[PDB]
Amino acid sequence: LIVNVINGPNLGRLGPAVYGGTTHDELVALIEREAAELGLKAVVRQSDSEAQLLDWIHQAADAAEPVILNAGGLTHTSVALRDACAELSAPLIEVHISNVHAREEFRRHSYLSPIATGVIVGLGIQGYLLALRYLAEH
Amino acid sequence: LIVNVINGPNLGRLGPAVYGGTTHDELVALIEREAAELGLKAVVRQSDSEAQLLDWIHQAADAAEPVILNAGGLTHTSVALRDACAELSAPLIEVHISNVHAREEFRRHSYLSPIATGVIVGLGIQGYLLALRYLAEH
Amino acid sequence: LIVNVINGPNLGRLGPAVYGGTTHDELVALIEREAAELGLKAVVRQSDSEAQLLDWIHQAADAAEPVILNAGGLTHTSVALRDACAELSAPLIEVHISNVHAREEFRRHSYLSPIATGVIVGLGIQGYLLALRYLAEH
């Protein structure tokens, strides 16, 4: 029923060559609308602070709620975030707006992918909506 | 006399397969009791925020107090934390509850170990108590 | 006209073998004086918090202002900081007080250098003043 969508650093700045022209507020609106259509309730949060992201992951773990996570640059760097996410009992779907495999080599490594249920990259902001649909059909 | 025990991200969540069933509050109690038995005063702090950890390390450097540090995932990732710890004039003992050498390869690298006095891993929460005893006998 | 000088973790602690004996407050004074002589206004900020640094970079991007950045240990570790800096339309000059190429191997890699206009290392705190002079003559 409840799905948490958590966005990490810089994703508040959305709005165009690499990440598209959709703003973060528009993304929240699109996600909330799609969730409603699927019979879910999406709670969307964004922070540039790793400690804040960790707290939101901890809350999802305590509530046994699924998470759709776009960790931004922390994807490639944060073991702390990986360890928080490893506590999740419900599914974790990693989303990247851009195709990280077509960019710098450092972006092709994720600490999160090995512990995620699955990963969607390169499908733009529709990746979040597709992640929701996965969760609704499961 | 005063020893600072600093715990990094996710260690507030303690309480069981990998890290044991002892909670962070219980750990603080056990450490305070052992410190008292050894004639020390332990000040135990935990944060998921790297900036907060840095501030506590800075304070220990200014006070010339020893530190027992379990940096959590930041062990493997944070040069900033290493540099703060390199300022410490009193001993630094790195502690890990789990045997990081028996886990993923990324956990086998520490930015802290080269600048620590010593390192204890895999002995559970008793590692903190053994670190205290080292400091008391030195 | 306005130049932002942003200092990352531990740089508040300046004041001597590796980084010199000039304190952060003295550095701010020296930078402000040099900026005035060059007809610039320098805004100098320091934080141990990556989220705070990101916010200051975001502000510079929105204002189309140049940045002189000494990211401290985050130089070697933070993709999030690199991505924020990649948004800057005005020049980015990376400065390191110490000669990072004469130190540990991990310090010889920077996420920032590939997206910076240029990089000054090893010239002490004069590196900041030289960065200002570059910006004034450009």
Ligand SMILES: Cc1ccc2sc(COC3=C[C@@](O)(C(=O)O)C[C@@H](O)[C@@H]3O)cc2c1
């Ligand atoms: C105006 C602006 C300026 C810089 C940046 S950086 C950013 C998102 O950071 C990241 C997101 C990814 O997760 C993705 O493709 O969704 C890839 C990851 O490598 C990158 O750090 C969004 C964004 C927006």
Ligand SMILES: Cc1ccc2sc(COC3=C[C@@](O)(C(=O)O)C[C@@H](O)[C@@H]3O)cc2c1
């Ligand atoms: C409920 C729960 C869920 C996830 C996590 S992660 C964690 C501590 O993080 C780490 C601690 C270590 O320092 C250690 O063995 O003490 C190893 C380090 O690799 C790891 O990130 C504790 C903890 C507790």
Ligand SMILES: Cc1ccc2sc(COC3=C[C@@](O)(C(=O)O)C[C@@H](O)[C@@H]3O)cc2c1
């Ligand atoms: C009292 C004290 C104790 C520890 C530290 S660490 C620090 C700055 O950190 C860094 C700065 C550099 O950017 C540089 O040469 O300016 C190099 C970088 O590798 C390092 O982390 C300044 C500082 C001051």
Ligand code: NA
């Ligand atoms: Na929630």
Ligand code: NA
């Ligand atoms: Na899309």
Ligand code: NA
């Ligand atoms: Na203390």
Ligand code: NA
């Ligand atoms: Na134990």
Ligand code: NA
């Ligand atoms: Na400014």
Ligand code: NA
């Ligand atoms: Na100098």
